[PDB]
Amino acid sequence: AATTVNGGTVHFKGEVVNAACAVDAGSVDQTVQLGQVRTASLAQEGATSSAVGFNIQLNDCDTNVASKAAVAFLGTAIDAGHTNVLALQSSAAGSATNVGVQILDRTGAALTLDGATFSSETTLNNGTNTIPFQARYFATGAATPGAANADATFKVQYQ
Amino acid sequence: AATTVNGGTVHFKGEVVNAACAVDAGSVDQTVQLGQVRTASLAQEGATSSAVGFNIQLNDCDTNVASKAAVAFLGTAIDAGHTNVLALQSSAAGSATNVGVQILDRTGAALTLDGATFSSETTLNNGTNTIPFQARYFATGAATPGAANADATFKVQYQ
Amino acid sequence: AATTVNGGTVHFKGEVVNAACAVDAGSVDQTVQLGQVRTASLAQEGATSSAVGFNIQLNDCDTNVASKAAVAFLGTAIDAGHTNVLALQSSAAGSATNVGVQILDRTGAALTLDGATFSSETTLNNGTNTIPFQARYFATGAATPGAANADATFKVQYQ
Amino acid sequence: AATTVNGGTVHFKGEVVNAACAVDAGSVDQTVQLGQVRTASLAQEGATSSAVGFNIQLNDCDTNVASKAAVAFLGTAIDAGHTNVLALQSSAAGSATNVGVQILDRTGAALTLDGATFSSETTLNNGTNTIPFQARYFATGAATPGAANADATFKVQYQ
Amino acid sequence: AATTVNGGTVHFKGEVVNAACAVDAGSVDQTVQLGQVRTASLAQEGATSSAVGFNIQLNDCDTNVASKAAVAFLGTAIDAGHTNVLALQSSAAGSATNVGVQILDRTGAALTLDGATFSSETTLNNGTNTIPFQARYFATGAATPGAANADATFKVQYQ
Amino acid sequence: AATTVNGGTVHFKGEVVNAACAVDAGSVDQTVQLGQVRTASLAQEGATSSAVGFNIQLNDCDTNVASKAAVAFLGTAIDAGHTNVLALQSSAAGSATNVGVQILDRTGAALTLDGATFSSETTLNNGTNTIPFQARYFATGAATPGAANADATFKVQYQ
Amino acid sequence: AATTVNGGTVHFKGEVVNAACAVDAGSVDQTVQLGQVRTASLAQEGATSSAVGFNIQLNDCDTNVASKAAVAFLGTAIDAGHTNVLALQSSAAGSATNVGVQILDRTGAALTLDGATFSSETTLNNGTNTIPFQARYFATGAATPGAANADATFKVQYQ
Amino acid sequence: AATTVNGGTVHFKGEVVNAACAVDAGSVDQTVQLGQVRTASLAQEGATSSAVGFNIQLNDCDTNVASKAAVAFLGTAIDAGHTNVLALQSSAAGSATNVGVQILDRTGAALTLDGATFSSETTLNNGTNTIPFQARYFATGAATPGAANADATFKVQYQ
Amino acid sequence: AATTVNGGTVHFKGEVVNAACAVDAGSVDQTVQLGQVRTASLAQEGATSSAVGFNIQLNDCDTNVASKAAVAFLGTAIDAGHTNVLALQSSAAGSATNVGVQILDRTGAALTLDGATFSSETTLNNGTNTIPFQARYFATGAATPGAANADATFKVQYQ
Amino acid sequence: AATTVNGGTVHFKGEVVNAACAVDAGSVDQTVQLGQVRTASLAQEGATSSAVGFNIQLNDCDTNVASKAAVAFLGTAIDAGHTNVLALQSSAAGSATNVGVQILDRTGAALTLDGATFSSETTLNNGTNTIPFQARYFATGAATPGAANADATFKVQYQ
C-alpha cells in the first residue's frame, strides 16, 4: 500500500535587503563563459581580447526610493600596478600566466576591483532593470596558455 | 617510464529504496536560489515575496507498484504559530529577522514542515516524473535585512 | 605540426519512450514569449489577456499503435480556487501579483494543472503531428505590474 | 490501451506593465540581422555602413492614457568618446575591432546608449503602433574583420 | 505625466569582412522550403526530386578587388559514399531514411560538402550580385517517409 | 589571390511522404492576408466578414494511387460552442475580442478544426492540383478592435 | 485505401478596426517597385527622380460615419534637415548614399514621415475608395550607386 | 542618501590557448537536445535513430598558423564492443538500457570516443569557422525506455 | 579606533608531485551523487543500476614528459568473489546489503579496486585534460534498502 | 511503550566579539583545497604555482561602527628570509621540501605571516561582506614532492 521513504534535502539561498531594488535570483550567482582566447592576441602588455556581455538584473525597482543604480566589483587584483585586472584562480596548477580578467561598465571603461569604486550610474525605471557589463582578457605580458577562471563579488549602490 | 603518483579520493553518496520510484541524483540535494527581496515587500505580518520554482524529479517509476506520489517536508519552523514557515539558519550573526521560507505544493498552499503532512498527490507516469514546488519568503512581522538561507529535508510517499 | 588543445564539453539530452509517437526535440523544452500585458486589461477577477499560440510536435507517429494523443500539464497552481491557473515564478522579488498563466487546449478551454486531466484528444496521422495550444494571462484580482514568467511540464497520453 | 509518457517542459515569459501600451511579443526579444560589411567601408573614424531597419511594435495602445511614446536604449558603449556606439560582444576571440553598432531613431540620429536619453516622440493611435529604428555600423578607426554582434535593452516612455 | 517601463532586448548579428563583396543580410541565414516529395519519386539509389532555387546575394561588390566569386558548402554528408549529399537532421525521431539534400551550383552539378570544393566561378558586377543555386532530394535507397530537414554553412571565395 | 571569408548558413525544410500527391513548397507554410474588417460588420453573434481565398497546391499527383483528396484543419477553437471558429493569437495584448477566423472548403461550409473532419473531396488529375479554400472573420459576439491573427495546420487525406 | 499525411501550416493576418472604412488586403502590406534611377538624375541636393504611383484602397466605406480620409506615413527620415525623406535600409552593405524616398500625396507635396502629419483629405464615397500617392527618389547630395530599398507604415484618419 | 547593499558573485570561465583558432564561447559547453525516440526504432542491435545536428564554432582563425582543424571526442563507451557509442549517465535509476549516443563527424561516420581518434579534417578560413557534427541514438540490443543523457569532452587539433 | 579581534583558522591542503600532470583541486576530493535506486532494479546477483558520470581533471599537462595517463582505484571490496565491487560504508546501522559500487573507466569495464590495475590509457593534450569515469550500483544478491555510501582513493600513472 | 536510549553528544563552537562585523561560521575554520602542483613548476627560488581563491565572509556588518576591514595572518614562516611564506606541516614524514604556502590579499601582494601586518583595507557595506584572498605555492629552492599542507590563523581589524 502506502510506502514512505527518505527523499532528500533542499537548501534555500537568498538575502533580504533594504534597498530601492532587489537583485534577481539569476544574477546573484552567475557564470560568464568567456570561451577561449589565443595567446597571439595577448602577446604583450595592454593587449585585450574581445568582450563578452553579462548583465546584472535588478527587480522590483521603486524609483521613488532611488532613481540611479551603480555597481562596484571586488576581487583579487593581478598585481599592484593593475588594480582593474582580476587575477586568475582555479587550482594550484595549469592557469594561464600574464593574463587577467577585466570588467567594463556601460561606458566601456574597466572597473577598479576594490569594491569601492562604482560604475557609471544608470537611470532606473520601476520594476525590472538590467545593468549591462562586459568582461574581457587583459595581458600584463606575453600570455602563456592555461585555464583562465576568475571570481568577483559585487555590491549595488542606489542613489 | 611509468611514474605513478597518489591522486586523491572519491566519495559516493546514494540510497537503496524499496519504492515505486527513485529520486533523481539532482533532486536529492539541491540548492534553490531565491535572490533578493526588499524589506518593503515584507513590511508586516503575512506579507509574502514572489515565488521561485523548484522540482523534485522521480525516476524509474512503475505505476503498477504505485500510481501517486506525495512529498512531505521537515525542517525547523520559525515559531509554533507558523508551522508552515521555515526558520532561517546560516550563522550566529547576520540573518534576516521576522522572515521565513514557505514551501508551496502544486496547489499553491504552504506546507507544514513536520515531516508528516504530505503535499497534494500527483498522478505518476512510468519513467520520469517531475513534482513541482515553489519557495517564497513569508514575513512574520516587519522584516529586517540580512541573509535568508534555510534548509529542509523531504520524504516521499507512494500510494 | 599538429597542435592539439583542450576544446570543451557537449551534453546530450534525450529520452527513450515506449509510445506510438515521440516528442520533437524542439518541443521538449520550449520557451513561449507572451510579450507584455497592460494591467488595465487585467483589472479584476476573471479578466484574461489575448492569447499566444504554442505547439507540441509529435514525430514518428504510428497510428497502428495509437490513433489519438492528448496532453496533460503539471505545474504550481496560483491557489486552490484556481486549479487551471499557473502561478508565476522567477525570483523572490518583482513578479506580478494576482496574475497567472492559463493554458488552453484546442477546444479553447483552460486545462487543470494536476498532471492528470488530459486535454481533448486529437486524431493522429502517421509521421509528424502538431498539437496546438494557447497561453494567456488570467487575472485572479486586480493585477499589479511585474515579471510574469511561469513554467509547466507536460505528459502525453496515447490511446 | 492508453500509454502515458513523460513529455517535456514549457517556459512562459512575459511582463505585466502599468502603461498606455504593451510591447508586442515579437518585439520584447528580437534579433536584427545586419549582414556583412566590408572593411573598405569602415576604413576610418566616423565611417558608417548602410542601415538595417527594425521596429518596436506597441500593442493595445490607449491614446487617452498617453498620446506619445519614445524609446531609450541601454548597452555598453564602445568607449567614453562614443557614447552612442554600442560595443561588440560575443566571445573572447574573433570580434571585429574599431567597430560598433549605432541605433538611429526615426529622425536619423544615433541614440545615446545610457538608458536615459529617449528617441524623438511618436504620436500614438489606438491599438497597434510601430516605432521604426535603424541599426548600422560605425567605425572608430580602421576596422578589422571579425564577428560584429551586439546587444541592447530598451525602455519605453509614455507621455 | 511620463510613465516609463522596461521594454525588452535587441540582439544584433553581423560580421566585418575584408573582402571584395559583403553577403547580404537576407542571405547570411536563410530558410529554403523544399516542399513535400513522394517516396514514389525516391524509390532507389540515385533517384532525385525536383529542384528548388535559392540565391546568395552579394552586396557592395568592388570588381577592382575581385572579379569573380565562388561558394563552398560545409555540412554533414549522409555517408562516405555520398560526399555531395547532405545528411538530414531535425530530431532523434521521425526523419526520412535513405534521403539527403543535394545543393547544385549554377552548372547543375552537385557540390561536395567539405567546405573546400568551390562552386563554378561567377563573374561579378559592381554593386549587387545574385549567385543562383538549387537544392533537391537525393535517394540513397528506397526512401522512407518522414521529416527531411538539413543545414549547411557556406563560405565565399573572391578571386 | 583568392580571399575566402565565412559566408553564412542555409536551412532546408521539407518532408518525404508516402502519398499519391505532394504538397507544393508554396503551400506548406503560407500567409493569408485577410485585410481589415470594420467592427460594424461584426456587431453581433454570427456576423461574418467577406471572404479571402487561399489554395493548397498538390504536386505530382498520380490518380492511379488516389483519385480524390481532402483537407482537414487543426487549430485552437475560440470556444466549445464554436468548434469551427479558429481563435486569435499573436501576443498577450492587443487582439480583437469576440472574433475568430473561419475556414471554408469549396462548398462554402466552415470546417471543424479538430484535425479529423475532412473537407469535401475533390477529384484529382495527374500532376498539379489546386484545392480552393476561403478564410473569413466570424463574430462570436460584438467584436472589439485589435489584431486578428490566427494559425492552423492541415493534413491531406487521399482516397 | 485512405492515406493521411501531414500537410502544412496556414497563417492568417488581419486586423479589426472601429472606423468608417477598412483597408483592403492588397494595400495593408504592398511592395512598390520603383525601378532604377541614374546617378546623373541625382547629382546634387534637391534633385528628384520621376514618380511611381501607388494606392491605398479603402473598402466598405460608410459615408455616414465619415466623409473624408487622410493618410499619414511613419518611417526613419534620412536626417534632421530632411524630415520628408525616407532613409534607405536593406543591409549593412551596398545601399545608395545621399538618396532617400519621398512620398507625395494627391496634391503632389511630400509628406512628413513623423506618423502625425496627414495628407490632404479626400472625399469618400460608399463602398470602395482609392487614395493615390506617388513615391520618388530625393537626393540629399551627389547620389552614389547602390540598393535603394525603404519601408514605411501608415495610419488612416477618418473625419 | 546612497544605500549600498551586498549584490552577488560572478564566475568567469575561459581558457588561453596557443592555437590557430579559439573555440567560441557558445561551443565550449553546449547542450544538445535530441528529443524523444521510440523503442520501436531501437528494437535490435545496430538500430539507430534520426540525427540531431550540432556545431563547434572556432573563432579568430589564422590560416597562416594552421589551414585545417579536426576534433576528437572523449567519453565513457557503452562497452568494449562499441567504442564509438557513448554510455548514458544522469542518475542511478531510470536510464534507458541497450542505448547509447553516437557522434558523427561531417563524413557521417561515428567517431571513436577515446579522445585520440580525430574526425576528418576541415579546411579553415580566416575568422569564424563552423565544424558540423551530428548525434544520434544507437541500440546495442532491444532498447528499454528511460532517460538518455550523455556527456563527452572534445579536443581540437590544428594542422 | 581600530578594533582587532581573533578571526579564525584556514587549512591549506595540497600535494607537490613529480609528474607530467597535476590533479585539479576539484578532483582531488570530490563527491559523486548517485541518487536513489530501487531494490526492484537490484533483485539478483549481477544486476546493475544506471550510471552516473564523474571526471578526474588533470592540469598543466606536459606531453613531452608523458603522453598518456591512467587511473587506478583502491578501496574495500564487497567480498572475495567481487573484487571490482566497492563495499558500502557509512555507519554501523542502516546500510543496504547485497549492493556495492562499481567504477567504470572510459571503456565501460569495471575497475579492480586494488590500487594496482590501471584503467585504459588516455592520450593527453598539453594543459587541461578530463578523464571520464562512471559509477553505478552492482547487486551481489537480492538488495535490501538502506544508505549506499562508498569511498575510494585513486592514483595516476603517466606513461 | 516508549524506549529511551542514550543518544550522543553535541559540541558547540563559537565566539562573542565586540566589533563592527562578525566572521561567518563557514569562514572561521575553513579548508582550502589547493590541488596538486608539479615540481617542474617550482624548480627554483621565487617560483610560484597558480592561485586558488578563498574568502573570509563578514556577517552583520555595521558601517556606522567601522567602514573598513583588514585581515592579518599568523603562522610559522618557512625561514627567516621568507616571512611571507608559510611552512608546511602535517606529519614527521612525507612533506614536500623547499615549498611553502603564500597568502595574497586583494591587491595581489603576499601577506607577512606575523599576525600584525594587515592586508589592504576593504570598504564595507552593511550586512554581508566578503574579503577575497588567494593562496599559492612558493618555492624557496628546487621543490621536491610530498604532502603540502599548511595552517594559518587570522585576525580582523575594523577601522
Side-chain angles (χ1 to χ4, degrees):
Chain A
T3 305
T4 320
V5 294
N6 182 58
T9 299
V10 185
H11 306 272
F12 303 98
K13 304 291 186 207
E15 166 161 307
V16 183
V17 307
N18 175 33
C21 304
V23 183
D24 183 66
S27 284
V28 286
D29 185 34
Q30 76 185 105
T31 318
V32 177
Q33 183 58 247
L34 306 184
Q36 299 196 343
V37 60
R38 294 179 56 229
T39 44
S41 318
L42 296 167
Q44 86 258 74
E45 156 90 53
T48 55
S49 74
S50 304
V52 169
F54 76 96
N55 303 293
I56 293 172
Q57 185 167 304
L58 309 177
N59 296 339
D60 198 30
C61 283
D62 194 317
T63 42
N64 281 326
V65 175
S67 46
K68 300 278 225 334
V71 186
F73 291 86
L74 167 74
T76 303
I78 195 153
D79 60 54
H82 288 100
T83 51
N84 58 6
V85 173
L86 189 65
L88 303 188
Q89 43 170 248
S90 61
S91 204
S95 279
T97 75
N98 299 320
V99 200
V101 158
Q102 247 179 0
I103 307 166
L104 324 174
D105 74 338
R106 87 184 170 67
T107 59
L111 296 169
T112 301
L113 298 155
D114 58 355
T117 316
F118 282 89
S119 69
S120 60
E121 283 185 320
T122 311
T123 308
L124 301 163
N125 56 255
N126 292 318
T128 310
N129 284 264
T130 313
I131 322 299
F133 289 97
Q134 282 196 339
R136 73 201 186 171
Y137 285 119
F138 184 99
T140 65
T144 72
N149 305 320
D151 295 305
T153 61
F154 63 91
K155 51 165 81 42
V156 194
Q157 164 174 107
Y158 301 96
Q159 313 202 230
Chain B
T3 131
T4 314
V5 299
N6 160 59
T9 302
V10 183
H11 306 280
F12 301 98
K13 313 281 189 204
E15 179 173 340
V16 177
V17 286
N18 179 26
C21 307
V23 181
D24 188 87
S27 289
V28 293
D29 187 50
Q30 63 183 292
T31 303
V32 181
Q33 181 68 242
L34 309 163
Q36 295 188 344
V37 59
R38 305 170 62 217
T39 65
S41 325
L42 306 160
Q44 91 266 336
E45 216 294 315
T48 61
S49 76
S50 314
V52 167
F54 70 99
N55 305 309
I56 290 169
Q57 178 169 312
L58 307 182
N59 295 341
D60 201 75
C61 289
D62 178 348
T63 58
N64 288 126
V65 179
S67 59
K68 275 135 183 283
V71 187
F73 286 91
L74 168 64
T76 300
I78 191 152
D79 45 58
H82 299 99
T83 53
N84 53 13
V85 180
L86 197 63
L88 302 183
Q89 54 182 47
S90 66
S91 199
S95 280
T97 63
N98 299 317
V99 201
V101 176
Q102 247 181 359
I103 299 160
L104 330 177
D105 64 350
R106 52 168 202 83
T107 51
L111 293 180
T112 313
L113 305 144
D114 67 324
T117 322
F118 277 91
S119 68
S120 68
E121 307 233 80
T122 303
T123 288
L124 299 173
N125 55 253
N126 290 317
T128 313
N129 299 257
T130 298
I131 288 61
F133 286 101
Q134 292 195 331
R136 66 182 185 194
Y137 288 118
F138 179 100
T140 44
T144 80
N149 307 314
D151 306 79
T153 57
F154 64 92
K155 53 184 74 179
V156 192
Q157 179 183 77
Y158 301 100
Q159 297 230 27
Chain C
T3 289
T4 317
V5 298
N6 181 61
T9 306
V10 181
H11 312 262
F12 302 104
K13 310 290 197 212
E15 183 157 88
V16 179
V17 290
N18 183 35
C21 305
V23 177
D24 187 78
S27 273
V28 285
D29 208 345
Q30 61 187 280
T31 295
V32 179
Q33 190 69 57
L34 297 161
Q36 291 186 345
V37 57
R38 305 171 64 223
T39 67
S41 315
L42 306 158
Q44 81 278 336
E45 215 286 327
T48 62
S49 63
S50 306
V52 169
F54 74 94
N55 307 302
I56 295 175
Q57 184 167 309
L58 309 183
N59 296 342
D60 205 53
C61 283
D62 185 335
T63 64
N64 292 322
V65 179
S67 50
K68 269 138 196 254
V71 180
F73 287 91
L74 182 59
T76 300
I78 189 151
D79 41 73
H82 290 104
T83 57
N84 55 17
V85 179
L86 202 51
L88 301 193
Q89 52 182 43
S90 48
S91 205
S95 275
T97 66
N98 301 312
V99 202
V101 184
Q102 229 165 21
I103 301 174
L104 331 179
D105 59 359
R106 60 169 194 77
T107 59
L111 293 181
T112 317
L113 306 137
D114 57 3
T117 316
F118 280 87
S119 64
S120 86
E121 297 194 62
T122 294
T123 289
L124 301 174
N125 60 252
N126 284 325
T128 319
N129 297 257
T130 294
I131 300 159
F133 294 93
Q134 288 193 153
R136 64 180 182 198
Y137 284 119
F138 184 97
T140 50
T144 81
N149 305 319
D151 307 283
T153 47
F154 63 90
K155 63 191 44 158
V156 193
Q157 183 176 88
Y158 302 97
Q159 299 229 48
Chain D
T3 308
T4 318
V5 291
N6 186 53
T9 317
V10 187
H11 301 289
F12 302 101
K13 311 291 189 188
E15 187 181 297
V16 171
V17 301
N18 169 36
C21 303
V23 177
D24 167 87
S27 305
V28 288
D29 195 29
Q30 71 179 297
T31 309
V32 174
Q33 187 55 246
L34 294 200
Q36 305 207 330
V37 62
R38 306 180 38 219
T39 46
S41 320
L42 301 169
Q44 82 250 81
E45 158 90 50
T48 50
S49 86
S50 298
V52 168
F54 74 97
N55 305 305
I56 288 167
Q57 187 173 301
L58 309 174
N59 294 345
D60 196 30
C61 281
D62 204 324
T63 293
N64 271 122
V65 173
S67 71
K68 315 262 220 315
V71 184
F73 286 90
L74 168 68
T76 300
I78 196 159
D79 70 26
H82 303 87
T83 53
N84 53 12
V85 177
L86 200 55
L88 304 178
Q89 47 169 65
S90 61
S91 192
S95 275
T97 73
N98 294 325
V99 207
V101 169
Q102 233 171 21
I103 308 173
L104 329 174
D105 63 355
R106 54 173 210 73
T107 73
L111 300 169
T112 307
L113 305 148
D114 54 357
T117 322
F118 287 84
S119 66
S120 76
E121 277 185 352
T122 304
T123 309
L124 298 171
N125 59 256
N126 280 326
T128 312
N129 292 268
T130 300
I131 323 290
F133 289 97
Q134 296 203 311
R136 66 175 181 200
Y137 285 121
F138 184 99
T140 62
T144 77
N149 313 280
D151 322 87
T153 63
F154 68 89
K155 48 164 77 53
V156 193
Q157 160 171 109
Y158 297 100
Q159 292 210 240
Chain E
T3 151
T4 298
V5 291
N6 169 60
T9 318
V10 188
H11 301 282
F12 298 99
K13 307 295 196 213
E15 202 179 338
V16 182
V17 297
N18 180 23
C21 303
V23 179
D24 184 87
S27 295
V28 277
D29 201 294
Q30 48 179 310
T31 296
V32 181
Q33 184 57 247
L34 304 174
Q36 296 192 346
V37 59
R38 312 178 42 220
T39 68
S41 323
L42 291 175
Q44 83 275 354
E45 202 275 337
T48 52
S49 65
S50 299
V52 169
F54 70 99
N55 304 287
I56 290 159
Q57 182 175 309
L58 303 183
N59 296 347
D60 196 45
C61 279
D62 185 343
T63 56
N64 272 343
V65 175
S67 52
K68 264 144 190 314
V71 186
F73 291 90
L74 176 60
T76 297
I78 193 154
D79 53 46
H82 303 90
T83 63
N84 51 18
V85 178
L86 207 47
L88 301 177
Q89 50 181 49
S90 215
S91 204
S95 278
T97 65
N98 299 313
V99 202
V101 167
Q102 246 176 1
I103 307 174
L104 321 161
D105 71 338
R106 63 168 199 74
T107 70
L111 293 173
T112 289
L113 300 163
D114 57 4
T117 319
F118 284 85
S119 59
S120 71
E121 318 219 13
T122 201
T123 290
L124 294 169
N125 64 255
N126 279 328
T128 307
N129 290 260
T130 301
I131 304 190
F133 293 93
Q134 285 182 344
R136 49 177 201 196
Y137 286 119
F138 185 98
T140 59
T144 71
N149 294 350
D151 310 298
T153 61
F154 65 90
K155 46 174 77 99
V156 198
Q157 193 181 65
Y158 295 103
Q159 289 233 46
Chain F
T3 291
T4 310
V5 301
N6 176 60
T9 314
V10 181
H11 305 282
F12 304 101
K13 314 287 186 188
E15 190 140 272
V16 178
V17 288
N18 177 34
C21 304
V23 182
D24 182 83
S27 295
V28 283
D29 206 350
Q30 73 181 286
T31 293
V32 180
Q33 185 65 247
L34 301 172
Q36 287 190 352
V37 57
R38 299 171 70 224
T39 61
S41 42
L42 298 169
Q44 70 261 329
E45 211 298 319
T48 60
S49 85
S50 304
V52 188
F54 70 97
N55 308 296
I56 295 170
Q57 186 185 300
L58 312 177
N59 301 343
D60 201 28
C61 283
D62 168 42
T63 62
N64 291 136
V65 175
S67 56
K68 317 220 164 161
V71 177
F73 291 91
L74 169 72
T76 306
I78 188 152
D79 62 75
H82 284 111
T83 60
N84 59 6
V85 174
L86 193 62
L88 307 184
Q89 49 175 232
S90 48
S91 206
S95 287
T97 61
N98 298 318
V99 201
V101 175
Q102 241 175 8
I103 298 165
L104 321 178
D105 62 1
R106 65 162 185 84
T107 56
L111 294 176
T112 302
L113 306 142
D114 57 7
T117 315
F118 283 89
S119 60
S120 57
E121 316 229 47
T122 298
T123 296
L124 302 166
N125 56 58
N126 282 327
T128 313
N129 287 267
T130 297
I131 312 185
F133 296 91
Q134 280 179 337
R136 79 203 165 164
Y137 283 120
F138 181 101
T140 51
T144 85
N149 305 306
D151 279 306
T153 60
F154 64 91
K155 47 171 67 96
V156 195
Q157 172 182 101
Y158 302 99
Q159 291 219 66
Chain G
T3 128
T4 315
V5 291
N6 176 62
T9 312
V10 187
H11 303 281
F12 302 102
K13 315 295 204 184
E15 193 174 271
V16 180
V17 297
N18 172 28
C21 302
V23 181
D24 191 81
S27 305
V28 284
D29 199 305
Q30 66 181 296
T31 316
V32 183
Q33 188 57 246
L34 267 52
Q36 295 190 346
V37 60
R38 291 174 59 224
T39 43
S41 325
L42 315 159
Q44 78 267 351
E45 154 83 32
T48 44
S49 86
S50 302
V52 170
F54 73 99
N55 301 304
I56 295 168
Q57 187 183 303
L58 308 176
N59 304 338
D60 198 38
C61 285
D62 193 316
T63 276
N64 266 319
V65 185
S67 44
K68 302 262 190 33
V71 181
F73 288 88
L74 176 64
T76 297
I78 195 148
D79 76 41
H82 294 97
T83 54
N84 55 6
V85 170
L86 198 60
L88 302 179
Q89 41 170 67
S90 44
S91 192
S95 272
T97 69
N98 294 325
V99 198
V101 166
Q102 234 167 19
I103 308 179
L104 325 159
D105 66 348
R106 56 162 201 88
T107 47
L111 303 172
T112 297
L113 315 148
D114 51 11
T117 319
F118 286 87
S119 67
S120 95
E121 259 170 2
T122 302
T123 293
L124 288 188
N125 62 253
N126 292 314
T128 304
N129 286 264
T130 305
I131 303 201
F133 297 94
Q134 296 196 321
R136 71 186 177 190
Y137 285 121
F138 185 100
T140 70
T144 77
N149 314 293
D151 315 277
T153 48
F154 62 93
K155 40 166 85 70
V156 192
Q157 171 183 84
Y158 301 102
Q159 313 211 41
Chain H
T3 166
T4 306
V5 292
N6 179 60
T9 313
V10 187
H11 302 280
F12 301 98
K13 303 284 197 236
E15 161 176 357
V16 181
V17 298
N18 180 21
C21 302
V23 179
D24 184 71
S27 302
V28 279
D29 181 43
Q30 66 186 288
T31 299
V32 179
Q33 188 53 245
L34 295 164
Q36 291 187 342
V37 58
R38 312 164 59 210
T39 62
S41 319
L42 299 166
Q44 87 276 329
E45 199 284 328
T48 61
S49 56
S50 307
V52 165
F54 70 98
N55 303 312
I56 289 162
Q57 192 186 291
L58 305 175
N59 292 343
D60 183 58
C61 282
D62 201 359
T63 61
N64 274 349
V65 181
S67 57
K68 254 153 211 297
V71 176
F73 289 90
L74 173 67
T76 299
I78 190 151
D79 52 39
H82 307 91
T83 56
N84 52 25
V85 186
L86 198 59
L88 307 181
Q89 51 180 50
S90 35
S91 207
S95 272
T97 79
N98 300 319
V99 213
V101 177
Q102 250 173 8
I103 306 160
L104 328 167
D105 70 334
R106 62 179 196 68
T107 69
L111 293 168
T112 296
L113 301 158
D114 61 352
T117 319
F118 281 88
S119 63
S120 73
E121 300 238 77
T122 301
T123 298
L124 304 143
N125 53 246
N126 282 325
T128 316
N129 302 253
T130 312
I131 314 306
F133 298 89
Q134 288 183 337
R136 78 184 168 191
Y137 286 119
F138 186 98
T140 55
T144 63
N149 300 321
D151 298 272
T153 51
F154 66 88
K155 49 174 64 90
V156 193
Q157 175 196 69
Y158 299 100
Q159 296 222 63
Chain I
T3 307
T4 305
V5 295
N6 169 56
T9 320
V10 177
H11 301 281
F12 304 97
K13 307 277 190 204
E15 188 176 332
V16 175
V17 296
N18 180 23
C21 305
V23 181
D24 186 65
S27 315
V28 287
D29 201 289
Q30 64 181 288
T31 299
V32 171
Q33 189 53 239
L34 300 164
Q36 297 199 335
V37 63
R38 293 173 61 215
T39 61
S41 325
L42 302 168
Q44 80 273 114
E45 205 286 326
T48 55
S49 84
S50 307
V52 162
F54 72 96
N55 302 306
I56 289 169
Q57 172 160 337
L58 303 179
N59 293 341
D60 188 50
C61 284
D62 192 345
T63 58
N64 284 39
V65 168
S67 57
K68 314 198 148 274
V71 175
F73 288 91
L74 175 63
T76 302
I78 190 153
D79 61 57
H82 306 95
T83 73
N84 52 2
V85 182
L86 195 56
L88 305 186
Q89 47 178 55
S90 199
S91 206
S95 279
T97 48
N98 298 314
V99 211
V101 170
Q102 241 179 2
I103 309 172
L104 322 168
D105 68 341
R106 63 172 191 74
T107 78
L111 291 194
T112 294
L113 299 153
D114 58 355
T117 316
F118 287 81
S119 57
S120 69
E121 302 219 89
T122 308
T123 297
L124 299 166
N125 56 255
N126 288 314
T128 300
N129 289 265
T130 292
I131 320 299
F133 292 94
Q134 283 185 344
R136 71 188 180 195
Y137 286 116
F138 185 101
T140 56
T144 87
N149 295 332
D151 315 272
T153 62
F154 63 90
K155 40 172 68 81
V156 192
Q157 174 188 71
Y158 301 99
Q159 298 205 68
Chain J
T3 293
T4 316
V5 293
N6 176 59
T9 291
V10 182
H11 309 266
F12 290 106
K13 266 70 169 75
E15 189 183 343
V16 178
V17 294
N18 175 37
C21 304
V23 184
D24 173 73
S27 296
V28 292
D29 182 39
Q30 64 173 300
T31 316
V32 180
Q33 184 54 247
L34 279 64
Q36 303 192 339
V37 57
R38 307 173 43 216
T39 55
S41 319
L42 314 159
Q44 84 246 43
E45 211 287 309
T48 48
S49 79
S50 308
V52 170
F54 75 98
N55 302 305
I56 291 167
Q57 173 169 324
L58 298 186
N59 292 347
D60 199 34
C61 281
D62 186 326
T63 49
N64 265 284
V65 177
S67 54
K68 317 261 226 215
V71 185
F73 286 91
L74 176 56
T76 302
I78 195 150
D79 69 55
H82 298 92
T83 50
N84 55 9
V85 184
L86 190 58
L88 305 175
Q89 68 195 37
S90 58
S91 185
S95 269
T97 79
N98 293 337
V99 201
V101 167
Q102 229 172 22
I103 307 182
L104 321 182
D105 68 343
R106 60 163 193 85
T107 72
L111 289 181
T112 308
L113 300 154
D114 45 5
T117 319
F118 282 92
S119 59
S120 74
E121 284 199 309
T122 293
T123 308
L124 307 145
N125 57 256
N126 288 315
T128 306
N129 288 267
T130 297
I131 326 292
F133 296 91
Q134 283 189 147
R136 72 188 183 191
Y137 288 116
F138 186 98
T140 59
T144 63
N149 301 333
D151 302 298
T153 258
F154 68 94
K155 60 172 65 80
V156 195
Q157 171 177 292
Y158 300 100
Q159 313 203 61

